[PDB]
RNA sequence: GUAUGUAAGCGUAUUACCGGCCGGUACUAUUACUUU
C-alpha cells in the first residue's frame, strides 16, 4: 500500500513533467514557426529566383 | 513580432534607459535571421554600468537556464555589442543571490536550508567563469599582503585570450565593485605543456 | 593519511627555513591553513602566500622572509577557558613581549593578543615565534 | 587452458534465451530452435551420443564441456545440476559459432 | 641560491623535464588526436594512450592496439595532434 | 596506503583544467546521451561506456559534455544495476577465487588473499549502506555471492 | 547446538578406546558416508555401500574406490602415471 | 495496541461521561481535555484523540513531568511504554587536561502518544514524578523519531 | 596626506507589525566548545 500510493504521486508528477515539457515543446515549435513565417514567405520565393 | 520593451527586459526591472537601449540592440541582431532563433529565448533581468577610470563596462544579468544557451553564441553576441555600444566593454554574469551559514542571533539560513550549491562561493567561481568566456583561468594564485590585504592573481590561458586581454583591466573594476577582492592578471605567456 | 593537514604544511615551512629556502610547496591546504597563514602575514613573519586552484584540494606556495625561528601546531586543540591563555603563552613562547599563540576562537582564527582584546577564548591551533 | 565458457554462458543468460535439460533440449533440437547444444562430459553414455546424433541430423554444433554438472549449472547461475543446454537465441554473442 | 624561488612564475625548461603530476597545477600530458584510415572519410578522435581497441564507424579494421604507456597506432594511419 | 600491501605507488587521473571545453566538439549533449543509453542496453558497465565513448567519438569527459556522469545518466533512464559496478566486480573476483580454492585446497597464499577480497567488500559495502544505495543490513555472504555474479 | 566441539561423530565410542585412536576415527568416518561427485553423473549422489564400493544413487553407476575414500591418494598418481606412459608409446 | 484490556477497567480519575441530565450535545463523543506542553513544547495531537488510559502519561494522567530538561539519544525502544536513552558528553577533567567521554544510561517513560520511537532517536525528556525505579523521566517531545528522508514517503 | 581597526550602506534569512532608531511581539539547523 505505501509503495502503490508513492507510485500514485510520482507517476502523476512524471505525467506533470511531460505536460510542462509538451507545452514548452509545442510553444518552441509554434513560436519559432509563426515568427519565422511572418519574416520569410515573400523573401524565400525571391531567394530561389536569384 | 515587435520585441522591444516590456518583453525581453522583465523579469527584473520594468525601466531603465541602459536596459532598454541594449534591448533595442538585441532586436537589431535578430533581424539577420540566422541569429534569430538562438538568441530570442535569452532574457536580460537587469543591466548595471560601472567605470574603470575612463570607460564604462556594461554588465549583463542572466536568469541561468538561459546562461548555457548564452555561452555558446557569446563571443559573436559580445563582439557585435562592442561595435554598436562602443566605448563599452560588454561582460556577462548570471544573477546569483548570496545565502548564509548562520548569520546572527541564534538564527537561520531558511528558505531550503541549503545543499552544497545554494551558498556563496559557487557563485564567486561562476563570476570569474562567465566574465572570461573562451580562455579559462588555468591557475589562480592568491596573494596575501603584509599589510593585511588580500589580492588574487588570476592566470589566463592563452587561447582566444585575444578578446579578453584588453578587458583585463576593466575586469578588475567589474570584480571590485560587485564581488570585491582586488584581482591582477598573469598569463603564462606561451603554451608550455608539462 | 593526513589527519591534521595543518601541521604537515607548517612543518614544511620550518624545514624550508632550516635550509634558508624562501619557498615551499604545501599540501593539501585547508581553510584552517589559509586562516593560519593570513594571521602570519599581519605580523610580517612570512611573505606572500598563494593558493593554486587544483580541482583536487589546493596547494600553496609560500614566500619566506626568514624572520621565523619556528612554527608549531597544537593538536589536540585544548579548550582554553581564558585563564589558561596565560599559562600556554608562558610555556612555549620565548618572551612575554613577543610571539603569538594562535587559537580557533568563536569569532575567527585569531592570535591570543587579538583574542584578549575581543575577550573570546577558544581551542588552540598553534604557536608562531 | 580454459577459462572459456564461464564468461560466455553468463552473457547468454542475461541477453538471450535458454532451455536446459534433456526433455527441453531434445524438443529444441527437434524443432530447430537449438542453435547450439552443449553436452556435459558426465552425461550417461547413451545421452551423450543421442544428443550428438539429434544434432548431426540437425547439423547443429555440439560443444563438449570441460567440467561437471555443478560446473554447468553454476555457469548458468542456477543452483541445479544441468546435464544438457540448448542456447536458443543469444543476443550479444560471438558464441553462436564456437567450439570449445 | 638556497633562497632560490621563483616557483610562482616557474621557469619554462624545468617544468617540461619533471612530470605530469609534479606541476604547480598538475595538468595532463594526455592530449587528443583524430585518426584517418584512408579507405574511410571518417575521423574518430582516439587517444595515444588509447583506452579503446577502437573500431572505426562500421569497419572493424583495427586503428590502434594498446601498449601500457602510449598505445601503438598501427601501420598506415595519419593523425593530427590537436583537439580537431 | 595500499591497505593490503606496503605499496606507496599512486597513479591517478590528471583532469584537464577547462571545465566546459572542447570547442571543436560538434556533438550535442543529446547525441552523447543517446549513445550512453544504447551501449548501456548492450550491457556495458558505466566504466566500459566511459572509456569506449571517449575513443570512438570524441567524448573527452562525459561529465563535461552532458552535466551528468555516466552512472547518473543511466540511473535517470533506469538502466542502473541493482548493486553498484565496483562491488559487482569485487564480488565477482571473491566468488571466482573461492571456487578456485575448493578445487585447489592448500593454496595458503590464495586463502589469505581470499580474506582480503571479502574484507574489502564488507568495508566498501558499509559505506554504501550509509548512502542508503544499499538497503541497511545488507550483508555479503559467500552462498549468495556465487549466484550474484552470474 | 554444536553439541560437542571436539568429538563430533566419535561420541558413539564415548570414554572407550582412548582419545588418540578416536581422533583418527573422526577423519575416516567423515570421508565415508559422504556424498562424492560422481564423474559419470556430475551429481554429488555417491555414497559408500560397502568397503571398496561406492554406488551413485542416480544413474546407478557403481564405482570401485578406496575403502574410506572414493579416491585414495595412491590412485590419483597411479592413473596419471599409466596415462602419461600411454602417450609416449603410441606416438 | 490493546483495547485498554487489562484485568481492571482502565478509567481516569474524575471523568465519567454523563449521558443523562445536563445540557445535550456537540459531537467529538469524548470529554477528553488535552494539554499545552508549554515551555513552548507543542502537543502531539494523538493526546487529544487518545483512547489509551496511561495514568503515568502527562497527557492522559494526573502527573507533573517536574524539573530537568535534557536531550538524549534512544538506545533501546524495547519496552512497552518506556525507552532507554544513552547520553554521551565530554566531562573535562582538569588533571588529565583532556576529557573522558562518559555515558549515563537512563530509562525514560515513553507515553504511547509517542509512536515511531526507535533507536537512534534524539528525544527531549523531562524529569518526571519518579515513575518506576529506573524510570525517572518521561518524554516531553520526540524531537527526532526520524527519518529526514522518511518524512515524505519514498517511491 | 594617510590607517580603517571602530560606525553606517549595497548583493535568495534583520523580514514583518504595534506605540512614540529605540523596545517589545512574531522569529528561526542540532551539538561539542567557547563568551557573558
Q: What is the helix (H) or strand (E) element at residue B46, kind and residue range?
A: strand B46-52
Distance, CA of D18 to CA of D12 (rounded, Å): 8
**Grid cell at residue F103:** 578445487
Task: List the one residue out of D28, D24, D34 whose CA is nearest residue D82.
Answer: D24
Please, what is the end-to-end C-alpha distance for chain B in angstroms?
A: 54
- Residue in chain C closest to H93 (alpha carbons) equals C79
Residue with cell 513560436: A31
Give the nearest partner residue to F42 out of D74, D75, D92, using CB atoms: D92
Q: Which residues of chain E have a CB within 8 Å of the CB of B193?
A: 16, 27, 29
- Reference B185, options B132, B144, B149; nearest CA is B132
CA of B119 to C1' of I12 (A): 10
Q: Rounded CA gap, H138 and H108, in Å?
A: 5
The rounded distance, in Å, linking the Cα atoms of B43 and B10 is 8
| Cα pseudo-dihedral B150, B151, B157, B161, rounded to 10 | 140
Specify the DSSP element, H or E, that contains F72.
Answer: helix F70-76
Distance CA H29, CA H51 (A): 12
Give dist(CA A18, CA C125) in Å, integer: 55
**Is chain D touching chain G, with at least 3 CB–CB pairs below 8 Å?**
yes
Question: Please, are residues A20 and A27 in contact by the beta-carbon 8 Å criterion?
Answer: no
Q: Residue B113 CB closer than 7 angstroms to strand I? A: yes
Long-range contacts of E3-7 (CB under 8 A, 24+ apart): E3/C20, E3/C21, E3/C22, E3/C66, E4/C21, E4/C22, E5/C22, E5/C23, E5/C63, E7/C23, E7/C25, E7/C61
- Reduced to 3 states (helix: H, G, I; strand: E, B; else coil), residue B189 is coil
Question: Which of C20, C21, C23, C24 has the alpha carbon at shortest distance from C9?
Answer: C24
**Cell 500510493 sits on residue:** A5
- Preceding amide of H18 cis, omega within 30: no
CB-based burial, G3-33: b 16+ in 10 Å, e otherwise: eeeebeebeeeeeeeeeeebeebeeebeebe
- Three-state DSSP state, B127: helix
> Nearest-CA neighbor of D63 among D26, D35, D22?
D35
DSSP tag of H63? -
E60 grid coordinates: 572493424
Residue owning grid cell 609534479: E22
In three-state secondary structure terms, B112 is coil
For residue H9, the SS3 value is strand
DSSP string, chain C: --S-HHHHHHHHHHHHHHHT-SEEEE-S--HHHHHHHHHHHHTTSS--EEEE--SSS-EEEEE--S--S-EEE-SS--EE-SSSHHHHHHHH-S-SSS-EEEEEETTEEEEHHHHHHHT--EEEEEEE-
CA of B53 to C1' of I3 (A): 24
E10/C23 Cα distance (integer angstroms): 12
Half-sphere exposure of D12 (CA within 13 A, CB side): 25
Cα–Cα dist H118/H77, whole Å: 5
Q: Say if A and H touch: at least 3 Cβ pairs within 8 Å.
A: yes
Q: What are the φ and ψ backbone dihedral angles of F128, each rounded to 5 degrees?
A: -70, -30
CA distance B11 to B105: 34
Q: Give G28-75 as a DSSP string.
A: HHHHTT--B--TTT-SS-EEEEETTEEEETTT--EEE--SSSSS-HHH
Interface of E with B in 8-47 (CB under 8 A): 8-9, 12, 15-16, 18-20, 22-27, 29
Q: Are H138 and H125 spatial neighbours (Cβ–Cβ below 8 Å)?
A: yes
Size of chain A, expressed as the number of residues it contains: 50
* Closest B-chain CA to E8: B141
E33 within 8 A of E46, measured Cβ to Cβ: yes
Distance of CA F13 to the CA centre of its chain: 16
* Residues 7-66 (C) with a CB less than 8 A from some CB of F: 55
- Is the preceding peptide bond at F4 cis, omega within 30 degrees of 0? no
Task: Give the three-state DSSP class for B49.
Answer: strand
Which experiment gave this structure? Answer: cryo-EM
User: If you search the block for the grid coordinates 582566444, which residue do you land on?
Assistant: B160
φ, ψ for residue F14, nearest 5 deg = -80, 105
- CA–CA separation, H141 and H138 (whole Å): 9
- Best CA proximity match to C37, nearest among C17, C55, C10: C10
Contact B27, B3 (CB under 8 A): yes
B89's enclosing H/E stretch is: strand B88-92
List % helix, strand, coil for chain F (3-state, nearest 5).
55, 0, 45
Inter-residue long-range contacts of B170-173, CB under 8 Å, 24+ positions, other chains counted: B170/B52, B170/B55, B170/B57, B170/B89, B170/B91, B171/B91, B171/B131, B171/B132, B172/B52, B173/B50, B173/B51, B173/B52, B173/B53, B173/B57
Is the CB of residue B149 inside 7 Å of nucleic acid strand I?
A: yes
* Nearest-10 Cα torsion for G74, G77, G82, G84: 180
For residue A10, the chain H residues in CB contact (below 8 A) are 155
B186/B140 Cα distance (integer angstroms): 9
Task: Report chain C residues whose CB lies below 8 A from the CB of H100.
Answer: none
Q: In the structure, do chain G and chain E come into contact, i.e. share 3 or more CB pairs under 8 Å?
A: no
What is the rounded CA–CA span in Å between residue H148 and residue H155?
15
Sheet strand arrangement including G62-64: G46-50, G53-56, G62-64
Phi (first) and psi of residue H109, to 5 degrees: -80, 125
Task: Determine contact, residues H84/H107, Cβ cutoff 8 Å.
Answer: yes
Joined together, the cell numbers standing for residue H138 give 518521561
Nearest in space to D56 (alpha carbons), one of D37, D40, D28: D37
What residue has cell string 467529538? H28
Q: Where are the alpha helices (DSSP H) in chain B?
A: 17-30, 36-40, 65-73, 75-85, 121-131, 168-178
Alpha-carbon gap, residue C78 to C73, rounded angstroms:
12
Q: Smallest Cα–C1' distance to nucleotide I27: which residue has it?
A: B107
B39: closest chain A residue by CA: A32
CA atom of B186 to C1′ atom of I6, Å: 36
Alpha-carbon span C65 to C61, nearest angstrom: 13
- Contact partners of A by the rule of 3+ C-beta pairs under 8 A? B, H
Amino acid at each position: 500500500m505505501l509503495a502503490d500510493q508513492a507510485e500514485a504521486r510520482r507517476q502523476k508528477v512524471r505525467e506533470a513533467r511531460k505536460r510542462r515539457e509538451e507545452r514548452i515543446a509545442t510553444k518552441k515549435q509554434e513560436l519559432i514557426a509563426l515568427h519565422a513565417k511572418e519574416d520569410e514567405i515573400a523573401a524565400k520565393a525571391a531567394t530561389a529566383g536569384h | 513580432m515587435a520585441i522591444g520593451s516590456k518583453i525581453i527586459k522583465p523579469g527584473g526591472s520594468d525601466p531603465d534607459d541602459f536596459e532598454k537601449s541594449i534591448a533595442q540592440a538585441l532586436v537589431e541582431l535578430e533581424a539577420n535571421s540566422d541569429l534569430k532563433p538562438y538568441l530570442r529565448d535569452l532574457h536580460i533581468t537587469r543591466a548595471r554600468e560601472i567605470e574603470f577610470g575612463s570607460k564604462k563596462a556594461v554588465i549583463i544579468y542572466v536568469p541561468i537556464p538561459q546562461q548555457k544557451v548564452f555561452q555558446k553564441i557569446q563571443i559573436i553576441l559580445v563582439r557585435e555589442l562592442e561595435k554598436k555600444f562602443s566605448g563599452k566593454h560588454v561582460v556577462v554574469i548570471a544573477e546569483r543571490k548570496i545565502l548564509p551559514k548562520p548569520t546572527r542571533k541564534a538564527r537561520n539560513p531558511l528558505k531550503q536550508k541549503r545543499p552544497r550549491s545554494r551558498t556563496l562561493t559557487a557563485v564567486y567561481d561562476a563570476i570569474l567563469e562567465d566574465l572570461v568566456f573562451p580562455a579559462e583561468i588555468v591557475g589562480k594564485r592568491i596573494r596575501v599582503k603584509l599589510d593585511g590585504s588580500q589580492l588574487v592573481k588570476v592566470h589566463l590561458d592563452k587561447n582566444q585570450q585575444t578578446t579578453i586581454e584588453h578587458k583585463v583591466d576593466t575586469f578588475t573594476s567589474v570584480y571590485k565593485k560587485l564581488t570585491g577582492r582586488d584581482v591582477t592578471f598573469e598569463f603564462p605567456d606561451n603554451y608550455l605543456n608539462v | 593519511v593526513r589527519m591534521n593537514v595543518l601541521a604537515d604544511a607548517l612543518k614544511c615551512i620550518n624545514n624550508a627555513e632550516k635550509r634558508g629556502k624562501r619557498q615551499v610547496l604545501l599540501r593539501p591546504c585547508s581553510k584552517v591553513i589559509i586562516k593560519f597563514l593570513t594571521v602570519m602575514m599581519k605580523h610580517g613573519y612570512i611573505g606572500e602566500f598563494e593558493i593554486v586552484d587544483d580541482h583536487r584540494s589546493g596547494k600553496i606556495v609560500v614566500n619566506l622572509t626568514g624572520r621565523l625561528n619556528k612554527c608549531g601546531v597544537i593538536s589536540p586543540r585544548f579548550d582554553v577557558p581564558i585563564n589558561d591563555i596565560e599559562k600556554w603563552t608562558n610555556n612555549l613562547l620565548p618572551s612575554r613581549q613577543f610571539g603569538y599563540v594562535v587559537l580557533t576562537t568563536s569569532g575567527g582564527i585569531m592570535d591570543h593578543e587579538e583574542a584578549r582584546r575581543k575577550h573570546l577564548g577558544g581551542k588552540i591551533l598553534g604557536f608562531f615565534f | 587452458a580454459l577459462e572459456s565458457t564461464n564468461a560466455r554462458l553468463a552473457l547468454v543468460m542475461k541477453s538471450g534465451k535458454y532451455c536446459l535439460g534433456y526433455k527441453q533440449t531434445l524438443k529444441t533440437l527437434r524443432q530447430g530452435k537449438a542453435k547450439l547444444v552443449l553436452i556435459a562430459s558426465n552425461t550417461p553414455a547413451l545421452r551423450k551420443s543421442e544428443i550428438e546424433y539429434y544434432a548431426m541430423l540437425a547439423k547443429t554444433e555440439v560443444q563438449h564441456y570441460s567440467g561437471t554438472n555443478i560446473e554447468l549449472g553454476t555457469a548458468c547461475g542456477k543452483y541445479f545440476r544441468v546435464c544438457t543446454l540448448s542456447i536458443t537465441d543469444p543476443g550479444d554473442s560471438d558464441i553462436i559459432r564456437s567450439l570449445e | 641560491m638556497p633562497l632560490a624561488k621563483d616557483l610562482l612564475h616557474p621557469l619554462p625548461a624545468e617544468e617540461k623535464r619533471k612530470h605530469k603530476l609534479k606541476r604547480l597545477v598538475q595538468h595532463p600530458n594526455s592530449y587528443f588526436m583524430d585518426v584517418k584510415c584512408p579507405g574511410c572519410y571518417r575521423i574518430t578522435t582516439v587517444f595515444s594512450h588509447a583506452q579503446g581497441v577502437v573500431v572505426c564507424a562500421g569497419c572493424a579494421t583495427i586503428l590502434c592496439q594498446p601498449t601500457g604507456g602510449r598505445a601503438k597506432l598501427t601501420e598506415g594511419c595519419s593523425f593530427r595532434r590537436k583537439p580537431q | 596506503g595500499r591497505m593490503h600491501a606496503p605499496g606507496k605507488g599512486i597513479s591517478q587521473s590528471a583532469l584537464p583544467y577547462r571545465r566546459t571545453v572542447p570547442s571543436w566538439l560538434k556533438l550535442n549533449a543529446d547525441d552523447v546521451k543517446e549513445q550512453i543509453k544504447k551501449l548501456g542496453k548492450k550491457g556495458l558497465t558505466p566504466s566500459k561506456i566511459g572509456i569506449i565513448l571517449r575513443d570512438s567519438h570524441g567524448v573527452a569527459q562525459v561529465r563535461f559534455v552532458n552535466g551528468n556522469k555516466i552512472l547518473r545518466i543511466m540511473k535517470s533512464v533506469g538502466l542502473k544495476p541493482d548493486i553498484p559496478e565496483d562491488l559487482y566486480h569485487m564480488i565477482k573476483k571473491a566468488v571466482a577465487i573461492r571456487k578456485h580454492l575448493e578445487r585447489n585446497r592448500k593454496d595458503k597464499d590464495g586463502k589469505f588473499r581470499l580474506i582480503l577480497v571479502e574484507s574489502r567488500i564488507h568495508r566498501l559495502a558499509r559505506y554504501y549502506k550509509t548512502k542508503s544505495v544499499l538497503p541497511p543490513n545488507w550483508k555479503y555472504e559467500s552462498s549468495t555471492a556465487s549466484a550474484l555474479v552470474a | 547446538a554444536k553439541r560437542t566441539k571436539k568429538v563430533g561423530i566419535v561420541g558413539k565410542y564415548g570414554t572407550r578406546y582412548g582419545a588418540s585412536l578416536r581422533k583418527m576415527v573422526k577423519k575416516m568416518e567423515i570421508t565415508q558416508h559422504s556424498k562424492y561427485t560422481c564423474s559419470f553423473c556430475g551429481k554429488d549422489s555417491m555414497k559408500r555401500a560397502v568397503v571398496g564400493i561406492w554406488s551413485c544413487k542416480r544413474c546407478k553407476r557403481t564405482v570401485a574406490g578406496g575403502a574410506w575414500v572414493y579416491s585414495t591418494t595412491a590412485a590419483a598418481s597411479v592413473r596419471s602415471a599409466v596415462r602419461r606412459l600411454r602417450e609416449t608409446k603410441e606416438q | 495496541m490493546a483495547d485498554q484490556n487489562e484485568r481492571a477497567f482502565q478509567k481516569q480519575f474524575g471523568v465519567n461521561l454523563n449521558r443523562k441530565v445536563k445540557p445535550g450535545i456537540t459531537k467529538k463523543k469524548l470529554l477528553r481535555r488535552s494539554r499545552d506542553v508549554g515551555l513552548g513544547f507543542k502537543t502531539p495531537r494523538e493526546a487529544i484523540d487518545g483512547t489509551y488510559i496511561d495514568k503515568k502519561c502527562p497527557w492522559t494522567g494526573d502527573v507533573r513531568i517536574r524539573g530537568r530538561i535534557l536531550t538524549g539519544v534512544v538506545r533501546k525502544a524495547k519496552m512497552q511504554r518506556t525507552i532507554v536513552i544513552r547520553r554521551d558528553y565530554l566531562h573535562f577533567v582538569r588533571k588529565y587536561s583532556r576529557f573522558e567521554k562518559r555515558h549515563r544510561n537512563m530509562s525514560v517513560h515513553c507515553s504511547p502518544v509517542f509512536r515511531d520511537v526507535e533507536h537512534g532517536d534524539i528525544v527531549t525528556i523531562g524529569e518526571c514524578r519518579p515513575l518506576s525505579k529506573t524510570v525517572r523521566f518521561n518524554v516531553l517531545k520526540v524531537s527526532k523519531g526520524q527519518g529526514a528522508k522518511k518524512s515524505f514517503k519514498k517511491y
